[PDB]
Ligand binder design. Sequence first.
Ligand SMILES: [Zn+2]
Ligand SMILES: [Zn+2]
Lengths: 55, 392, 91, 97, 76, 61, 54, 227, 35, 82, 110, 40
Amino acid sequence: PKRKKNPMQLRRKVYGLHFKEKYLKMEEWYYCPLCAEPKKPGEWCRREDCRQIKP
Amino acid sequence: YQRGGWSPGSKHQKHMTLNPTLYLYRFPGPHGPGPYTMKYWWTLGCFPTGMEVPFRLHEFLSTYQQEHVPVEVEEWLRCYIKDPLSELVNASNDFFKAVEVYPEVESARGYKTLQPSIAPLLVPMKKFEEQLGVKISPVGLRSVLSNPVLKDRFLDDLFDYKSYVEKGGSTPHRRLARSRFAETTADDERSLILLLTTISEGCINAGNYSDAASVLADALMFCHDPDSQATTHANISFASLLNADFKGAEYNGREAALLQPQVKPTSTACARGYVGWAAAAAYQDDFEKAEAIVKDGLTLYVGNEHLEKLANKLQALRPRSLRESRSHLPSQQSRGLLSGSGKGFSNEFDWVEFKNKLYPSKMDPRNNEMGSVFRRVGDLGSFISTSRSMER
Amino acid sequence: ALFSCFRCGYMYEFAVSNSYCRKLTLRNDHCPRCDQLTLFRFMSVSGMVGNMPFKPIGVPGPSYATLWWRKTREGKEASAPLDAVCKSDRW
Amino acid sequence: GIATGGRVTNEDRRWWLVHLECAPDITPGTFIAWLDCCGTHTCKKLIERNIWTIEQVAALDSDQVDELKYREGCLKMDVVWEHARTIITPLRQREVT
Amino acid sequence: TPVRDRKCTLQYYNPIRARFVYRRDKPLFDKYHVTARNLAPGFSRGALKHDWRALGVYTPDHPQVPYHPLQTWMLG
Amino acid sequence: KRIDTAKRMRRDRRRIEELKTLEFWGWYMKLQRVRGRWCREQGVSSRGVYGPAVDAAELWG
Amino acid sequence: MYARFRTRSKFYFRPARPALAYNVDPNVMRRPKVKRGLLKGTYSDETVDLRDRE
Amino acid sequence: TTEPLMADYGWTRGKLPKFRARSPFHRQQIARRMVTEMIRKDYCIVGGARAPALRILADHVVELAKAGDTDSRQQLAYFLHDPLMVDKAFDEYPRRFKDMNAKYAMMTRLKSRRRTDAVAMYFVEYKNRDMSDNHKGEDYSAGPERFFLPPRIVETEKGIQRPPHMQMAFDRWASKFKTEEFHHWWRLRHAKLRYWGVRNVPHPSDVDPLWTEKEEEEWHNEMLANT
Amino acid sequence: TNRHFFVARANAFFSRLPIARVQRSLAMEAVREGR
Amino acid sequence: GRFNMDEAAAALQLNPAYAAALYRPLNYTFHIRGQLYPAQKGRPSRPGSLAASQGRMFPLYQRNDRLDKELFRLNSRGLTTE
Amino acid sequence: LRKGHQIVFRALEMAQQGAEAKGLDKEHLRVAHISCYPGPTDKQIDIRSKGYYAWKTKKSSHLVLTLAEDPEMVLPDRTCLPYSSLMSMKRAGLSAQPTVIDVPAITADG
Amino acid sequence: RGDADRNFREAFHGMSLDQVLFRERLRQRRMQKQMEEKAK
RNA sequence: UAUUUAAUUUUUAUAAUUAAUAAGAAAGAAGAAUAUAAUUUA
RNA sequence: UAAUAUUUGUUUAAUGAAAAGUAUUUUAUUAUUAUAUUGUAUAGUAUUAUUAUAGUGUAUAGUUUUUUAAAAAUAUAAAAAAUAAAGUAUGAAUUAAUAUCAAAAUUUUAAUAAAAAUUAAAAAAUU
Ligand SMILES: [Zn+2]
Ligand SMILES: [Zn+2]
C-alpha cells in the first residue's frame, strides 16, 4: 500500500460478487422428514434410516 | 525502528535494543480486559504473565462473606420462617387482584392487536407458584387472558381457591403433614386442578405443547379423585401427543383407561384415554395394535364420536426396522430446530460430552476413528494387543 | 529379503512390503531345523513389491548374494537330483 | 467381437472367422482362455462345470449360458458362447486337413 | 418490512442440482435402489414447477409421461 | 557399578520381551487353530466364490 | 447477494470519549439524575457477560 | 495400474483422486491404515478426497477376496498393517458379496463437518451386512459406550453370535484398557495436550477413569445379554 | 469462451453409434485392398 | 493366559517393582533430570475444587529409591579402607 | 461454517428462553434488532527476527439482539421435500405425506 | 430376539406385551371392584 | 500497493448493422471419481 | 495495509543426559547397615525458538501431538514426478498529505513533470 484508503475504498469491495457470494448469502433448506432437523439437499446424517433412504 | 508507541500495548513494529520489553504472553489490553485473559483468570488463578497480582477481594465479599452465618444465629433462623398458610392467602389474594385488573384486549379489524404484556403479573405469580409448589406457564397465562371464556374460568377458579383457602385449611399441606407423620379431593384442590387445566388449555392454543404437558403433571399431583385422575391423565395423553412424547402418551393414555370401573358413567375421560393410547400406538406406526385398541374402545364403549372419527380415519389409512422413523408433526420440527447438529457446531465433530465435561473430538472416549488420541495409545509395555505390524 | 536364524542359520526368502518396514532387520519365525520360535537377521536385499507405471518391475535388482542363493538352490546341480521325480514344470 | 454392444451382428462373425487363420495352430480342444472376452472369472466358472474345451462351450444349451451370466454372474458370456458357436465348425474342417 | 425469508426454491431449477439428475448413484444406496432417483419424468431437469408433460413438446424417440395435476404439498 | 547396571537393565528387558513374544505367537497359533476348527462347520473354504473344482484344476491356484 | 451489508463508518474511526478534568462532569449541577442509557434509548433485559465464571 | 489393488492417484478421470498428503509414499501409508481400519470395522467416517479413495480401494479388497487365490491372499497381505484382518477379509466377504458384481462399498456424505477445518465428512460402509458373519446385526447410528465395547446391536437382532476367533482378538485388544497404566496414560495425555495447549481439556485431577469395575460388571452383564 | 454450443458435449450419447464396429469394418476394408 | 508382567517377573526372579521400571522412562523411577509436564506437577485447592497432588493422580510414575540406591549410586562399605 | 453465526445462535437461543420466560409467543418472534459494537481487547507478543517484536491484538465485541413479536407474520413452508427424497421414501415403503391424527381438545369436567 | 418375540406375540393371539399386561391389570382391578361389592 | 495490460466473474439455443486490435434461477467432486451417464447387483 | 502474510498436530527408534543456577512435590521415598548435617523431577540464546553445549555409560522398550478435492510461477528431484495457492479459525509487518479519482495524446512552463491548457475517452469485482 502506498496510501491510506478512505471509507469508500473499504466500501468498494462489498459491491463485488465474490464478497456477496462468500459472506452475505442465504442457504436453501427443508426439514429432514426422518430427523426434523434443517437440512441442505445432498448432505445426510449418520443414522440408519438416513443412509439407505437418504431423504 | 519504532514505527509505533513506546508502550507495551502499542500497534506497530518495535525493536529490542531500543525498546526493550520482557516477554508478556497475553497482556490484557487498554480497555476491558477481555474473555481470553479472564479465561486464564478463572482457570489457572491469574493472568498468564504473572505480573498481574491476583486480586479477588470483590468476589470474596460476594460469595464467602455472604454465606458466613454463625451457628448461634442459623440455629435460630428456621424458628422464624413465615407461616405458609398466611403466605398462600396473601399470594392468592394479590395474584388475583393483579389478574382482575388486566385490561380486556381491544379487538381491531384487519390487523391483530398486540396484547398488553404481563409484566406486573410475573411478580405475584412467582411468589404464588412456589408458595403452592407448581410452576406455571407465563405463555399459557397470557393466552388465557386473551380469550374471554378462559379468562372467566381462570378468574372464578382463582376466586374459589381464594375463598376455600381462607375459610378452610390448605389440603396439600394437610396431606403433606399427615404423610410423613387417603381422602377424596377437597374443595380447594378441585378449584386448583380446574384452574391449572384451564391454563394448560390456554397454553395449547398458543402452541406450547411441551410446557402444557409439563403443567398438568403437578395437576395430577394434586388430584386424588379417580374422576379427576382419569380426566387429567387423558389430558396429559393429548398434551404429550402434540409434543410428540409418544412413550408419555402411550403411558398416560392407559391409566385414564384403567380407571373405567370406579369412574362415573357421566365421564368422557376413559374414552379419551383410549383415543390417546390408540393414537400414540398409531404414531409409532403400529397400525394393527391401533385398530385393535379402537376395536376395544368401540367394544366397551359401543359407538363413540372420537372413536368413530379414529376408527374411520384409521380405516382410511388402511417394516419393523423403519417404524417411528417419520417426523409426522410440526412440534418435533420445532424441537429439531433447536438441539440439532448443524454444520460446524453442535455435531459430533466439535466438542463431545463426557461426564458433564467438554472435550475436543480428538479425545472422544466413545470413538477410536482416525485422528483420535486412542489410536496412538501403543501397547503400554505389557502384552501385544493386536496383530498389527506397523501401527500399534 | 534373505533371512537366517542366529542359531542354525536356516536360510529362506520372502518379499517384504512397505507395511513391514519395521520388521526388515529382525524377524521372529519358526525354524524347521530347530523346532521352536527363533530370531532371523537380514543379510541380503532382494527386489521390491510394487512398481511405478511405465517402469520395469524387475530392477530394484536383487543382489549377487540372493542370485548366488538361487544358483545353489534351484540350479543345474540342485535340480538334477530331483528331476527324476518331478522336473518341476511337470507334475 | 470384443467391444461390441448388445447383439452380435454377422459382420462381427466375419472378424472372428478372419482371425481363425491369423493364428496358425488352433484346435477345437484348445483351452478356454483363447476366446474373446474370457477373463479370469469367466474361465474359472466354466472349469467347475467341467468345461475345458471350445467344443464344450459350443455344446452349451443357452440356459446354462444365462445362469452363467445372471444367477452366477460371468458377464459377457453370450459373447464367448457365440464366439464358440461360430468357430467350432471351421476348426473341425481345418483339423481334418 | 415483511420478513426477508425466501419461499421454496426447492422445486425450481438449480444449476448445481441439475448435474445430479443424470449422475450414477449405484454405490450410494444399499437396499433401496430406484430407476433414476433425481430424474423427474416430464419435468425440466428434476424441477417440479417446470412441468412440461402433456404439452406440445415434440420428442419423436423419447418417452413422455401423461399429465396428472400436482398436489399443493409437493410445491409449497 | 553403572556399566554393570547399564547392562543389567538392557539384558533383562531383552529377556522378558521374548516372554511377550512367545506367548503372543502361542496365542496367535491358538487363534488360527480356532479358525481351523470353526471354518469346518460353517463350511468356509476361504478360497473365494468358487467351488472346490476350480482350485482342483490348479491352473488358477 | 440477497442480504444487504454496507460497511459502518464507526469501525473506521473510534476516538476515545473525552476524559474529565478533576473528575468534574461540568453539567452534574444542571441536568437530571436519569441514566444516560435510558434517555439515549438503550435498554436490555439480560446482560450476559462472558467474562463471568458461570 | 489396471491391477485391482495398485493405486494411481491423479486428478485426471482415469485416475482415482489424490488426497492431500506429504508424499505419494505418505498417501500409500494413509490409504493402507484406512483400508485396514475399514476391514476391521465396516464403517469409516472419513473427510475429504480420502473417502472416494476408500470406496474404490474397498471395492478392490472385495474383488481380491472374491478372487480367493494364494496370489491374491499374498498381495492383500502386502497391503495391510493387520495380517489377521486379511484372514477376516477372505472369510467374510465372499459369502457377503456372492450375489453382487459391482460397487461393494457405500459412501454417504454427512451434513456435519470437522470443526477443525471445512473439510466435509463422508460415511463409508460395506454394503449388505445381513450376510456378514461378525457384523450381522450391528447399529452404527451412534457409537458404543467406551469404544472398546462391542458396538450397538439392533433390538430385534440381540441374540446373535460371532466367530469366536474374532471376539477372542477383540477381547485381548480390549483387555489392555482395563489395566491402570492405561489410566496413567490417560491422565498423562491430559497433561500433554494441556501443555501443547488445547482448549477444553480438563486438569488431570478432574479426569475420572474410562473404566471402573462397577461399569465392567454391568457392561459384561449386558454383553452376555447380547452374547 | 463460455457459450452453449462450445461448453456442451456429446459424450453421453456415444452409444448411439458403434465406434468399435466401424473401426473393424475399415480394418476389413484395409485387408480387402491389401494395405 | 496373558503376559502379566508381575508373573513374568516372578518366573524370571526380576523383583516385579523393577521389571515395570524397565518399561517407563528413567525420569519416573530414578533421580535423573527429565522432561516434566506442568500439569503433572500438582495444584493447591481452589474454592470449587479440592487439592491436586502427584501422589494421588500419578502413583506409578513416582520415584523409588530402593531401585535407585541399589542400581545407580555406590554403597559405602564396599570402599571402606579404614 | 462461520464463528459469528455460532455466537449469534447462542444469543438467539438464550434470548428466546428469555422471551418465553417473559410470556411471549415462540412462533411469532422476529429479529427486530441485531447489532455489534466494539468491545474489550487483549494483547500478545508476536516475535520477529533480528530482535523485532509486535503486539497481536486479540479483539472482542459486544452483541445486541432484540426479538420482537409480530402477529402478522406468515412463514414460508419448509416441509417441501425434493423429488428424489419423495420417490426414495416411496420405494422404502414410507408415506411421503405425514400422518395427521384428529386430537380432541383437552377439557376438564372434573 | 426377533423370532423370540415373533413367538411371544403369536402365543398371545397377536397381542403385544403392553396390550397383554393392560388386559390383565384391567381384570385385576375389575375383580378388585368385585371384591368390593362382595365385601360391601 | 496505484496505473497499466492479460485472464476470470462459474452452459450465452443465437452471435457481430458500429468501437478497439457479453452472459436465466447456483455451489460440495467438473468425477459418485478405479475414464461405460447406471454393465445384471440384497 | 488486513476478507493479508504466519499458524495450522493423522502416527515415535529425542537411547541417554552430571555443565541448567527460576517452576507450592500436602507425607516423592529404605525395607537401611548404618551412624550427626545437607540436597535429588520441565525455563541457555527476550519464546513451549533452527534447536542446544558436553562427561558419563551402554544396542531390537517402534520410548506415540503436523491441516487441505484442479491449473500458472517459485523451491527439490527425476519440459514429466514429488510440494504449495478459492479454503472454516487465528491474525501480525513495511506503507499512509489528500478530494469517490487521476486512464490517452499534444505542446508549454526555472531541471521526469501525476503542474498548466486543449483535445479527449478511463464502469464494478477478483487473479
Ligand atoms: Zn436424517
Ligand atoms: Zn534355526
